[PDB]
Amino acid sequence: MQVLHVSSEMFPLLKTGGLADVIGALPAAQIADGVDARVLLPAFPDIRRGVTDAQVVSRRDTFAGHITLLFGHYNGVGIYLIDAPHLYDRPGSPYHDTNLFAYTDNVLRFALLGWVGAEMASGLDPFWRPDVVHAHDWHAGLAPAYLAARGRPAKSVFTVHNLAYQGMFYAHHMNDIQLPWSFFNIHGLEFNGQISFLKAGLYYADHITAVSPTYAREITEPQFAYGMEGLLQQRHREGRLSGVLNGVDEKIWSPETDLLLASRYTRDTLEDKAENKRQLQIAMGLKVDDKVPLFAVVSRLTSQKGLDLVLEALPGLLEQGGQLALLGAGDPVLQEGFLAAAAEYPGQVGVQIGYHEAFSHRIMGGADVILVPSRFEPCGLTQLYGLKYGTLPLVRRTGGLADTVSDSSLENLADGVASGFVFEDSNAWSLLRAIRRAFVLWSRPSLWRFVQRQAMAMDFSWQVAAKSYRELYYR
């Protein structure tokens, strides 16, 4: 089977969001799983620097200028690049000028991405054509549309990584992107008076995907849907809306090999995790002290994430002996409160304001618990890391989290399935209850170790996502 992924970025060559890890990690899983997967990306400069061996496949004109299709490999997976300097050769963020405004011609720039995707399905490359074009997020949102206009030469699945970015453009661009006029219709890429690459992808795709089974069900509810509820419910009725959980690259994230840690450890050497802790408390300003549970937060500081809730809970958490190390940024109000808390409880509350992937690993590897109290969770990733590192996640029961963590109930404990802590409601009382639960578990160290081994044993690798999508593709 032959899938072609169409996105706008790919770890590690270029990344601005979690989407790029998928594109960077899924296709290789697929390759090893019976699916011949390839990737089509704009030829952004540092996307291009990475593919040393690129060679020409075709030189063509376009409704947006001279493209020249290249092909080479990267870490063993086939990459196609749309070489189009007037469009793609730009320093700064591939999405905007130094002055932080989008590139006005962006519509042309990503319609192009879609169109090449669709063209691939019609044989733009004489040696290889995809059975399925897998389009990814609004950037590739038109690919399922161009496909439709070509009477669906290959099947298309579109996954939404960010229901939030609608990919809006003015209606009068209909005259530039070369799709059938009829497509600009509420039943089609029309959305609140404008074009929407997303509504496009959402409407035209043979089948749609969200990043988790439940967030898949979730977005059919109007609270979640950013106004796409109608379409979504329908695709659901029809059975062309499901969720597939994303994966975790063992190569980057994994306590056995993580070169960022004071000490690597395994599921049956958890005694080795202790220096990692010690070091963390140290590095963060916290009483070095192992008799006590260290709760971490590594997240954008926002309401969606639940940190207002963490802040309300804080005093209680501290009251019962715990400590908190936080690493993130976002809403001012929150930043204040957490600094205030550090000031108020120096030694047991330690707060870094900012962002820092290297340091997050040291956190992920030192902490005892990882707090993910989301009001809703589009990209349930943090908690997978926790599980993988044996640092038990405490999470709200929503999106990916609801699919990924097992509460430390007696049931789950005896069934050897418990892997963390869960709370139902989005208020501080219920969070506190899970916090309480954590201490109670903590105070029975052998059980704690029991649950960590369980967390660590769970398979949330890409090989899993691969199977899932493989199966999808054959339908």
Curated annotation (Swiss-Prot):
Q: InterPro entries under this entry?
A: Glyco_trans_1 (IPR001296), GS/SS (IPR011835), Starch_synth_cat_dom (IPR013534)
| Residue ranges that the Swiss-Prot or TrEMBL entry lists as coiled coil | none
User: Keyword annotations for this protein?
Assistant: Glycogen biosynthesis, Glycosyltransferase, Transferase
Record-level GO cellular component terms:
cytosol
A GO term, aspect molecular function:
alpha-1,4-glucan glucosyltransferase (ADP-glucose donor) activity
Instruction: List the Pfam families.
Output: Glyco_transf_5, Glycos_transf_1
- Which pathway does the database say it acts in? Glycan biosynthesis; glycogen biosynthesis
Top-rank lineage group of the source organism: Bacteria
SUPFAM superfamilies from the UniProt entry: UDP-Glycosyltransferase/glycogen phosphorylase
Binding residues for ADP-alpha-D-glucose: 15
The catalytic activity, as recorded, is:
[(1->4)-alpha-D-glucosyl](n) + ADP-alpha-D-glucose = [(1->4)-alpha-D-glucosyl](n+1) + ADP + H(+)
Xref: NCBIfam families:
glgA, PRK00654.1-2
What does the protein in this record do?
Answer: Synthesizes alpha-1,4-glucan chains using ADP-glucose.
**Full protein name:** Glycogen synthase
The record lists the organism as Escherichia coli (strain K12)
